[PDB]
């Protein structure tokens, strides 16, 4: 059984320009567990990204939190890029500070 | 605390 | 309120790319407290919450011994299942296992669990009575018959009703300051419109613990599900959780709508209006 990931991109704390925060990309509901997750700054891959230990929900589907420390600005655009066996091409979700 | 035995399918 | 302790185990075979990788994680309620990664530096069960560090060397040795033995059993299980399902040694496969116990507000036994999955679907599970098994398919009946003969359920029952309950209680007492806390959600409502015709109202719940929460929309005091969106409760990364519920409303009718929040940390449910 294969399941496609759900993706949420959001900050740990309410976003304030010029103040350090954490950028999160939460991927969940997927199977198998093999997944590629990058955080992007203005379309470029962020080098230092950490992640949670693989766990799963009552339906057996996997979830992971990917996160990096960052200082948001008005200029900079952030996103999460995900590839999985269920995806024909990488899926990009932009960070919207109101979601 | 984990269960203290070896369970095999 | 009620509490749980759960362990979650995942092993993945990757032929031509070495031997299987194994990950184990332990939780009390929504707080991870231990981990093991078969390819990580330490090769030991590792702490992930401050209160578990109260446990001594006999514990860390014992839990390390048990989790490593578990990893090796999953390696055996992967071969066993490949045989049961008559599969080649070319493809990648996944074994998962979960077990644990639930207690009520009086910290007494409510329920126990012990179950397995193969390649994303159920394989075998212990029933609520802790005496019998549910086999998911024909292949799993082989495991079922084997476990019934060797009286596995009886041994598991003793753990689930005794050891599991007692150690959950111990953890709750040892980590009282954090595990027994109830952080009520910080709540607010936002308003957004791209047209003259409709607006989105979004009801926010932030910085709450435990993860358990209910967010509902009402219109004129009646529950409203049409034209709503509810996101999965998500981790903030600091031990708290976040959630939002949104509704699309006609321009000029925003005041008909209320957001209702239920959480253990709230003495009574909360009502929000634009």
Residue numbers in the entry:
A (entry chain B): 1 to 99
B (entry chain C): 1 to 9
C (entry chain A): 1 to 274
Quote the study that presented this structure, word for word.
Phosphopeptide antigens are naturally processed and presented on human tumour cells by class I and class II MHC molecules. We defined a canonical motif, involving a phosphorylation at position 4 and a positively charged side chain at position 1 (R/K), accounting for ˜ 50% of the HLA-A2 phosphopeptide repertoire. For phosphopeptides with this canonical motif (hereafter referred to as canonical phosphopeptides), the phosphate moiety could act as a “phosphate surface anchor”, mediating extensive contacts to HLA-A2. To address this, we determined HLA-A2 complex structures of three canonical phosphopeptide antigens (RQApSlSISV, termed PKD2 and derived from Protein Kinase D2; RQApSIELPSMAV, termed RQA_V and derived from Lymphocyte Specific Protein 1 (LSP-1); RQIpSQDVKL, termed RQI and derived from adenosine monophosphate deaminase 2 (AMPD2)) in both phosphorylated and non-phosphorylated states.
As with previous structures there was little difference observed in overall MHC structure (rmsd 0.62Å) for both complexes. As a result, the molecular surfaces of RQIp (left) and RQInp (right) accessible for recognition are very similar. Secondly, in HLA-A2-RQIp, as for PKD2p (right) the phosphate-mediated contacts elevate the main chain conformation around positions 4–5. The proportion of canonical phosphopeptides in this category is unclear, but this group includes both RQIpS, and the RVApS phosphopeptide derived from Insulin Receptor Substrate 2.
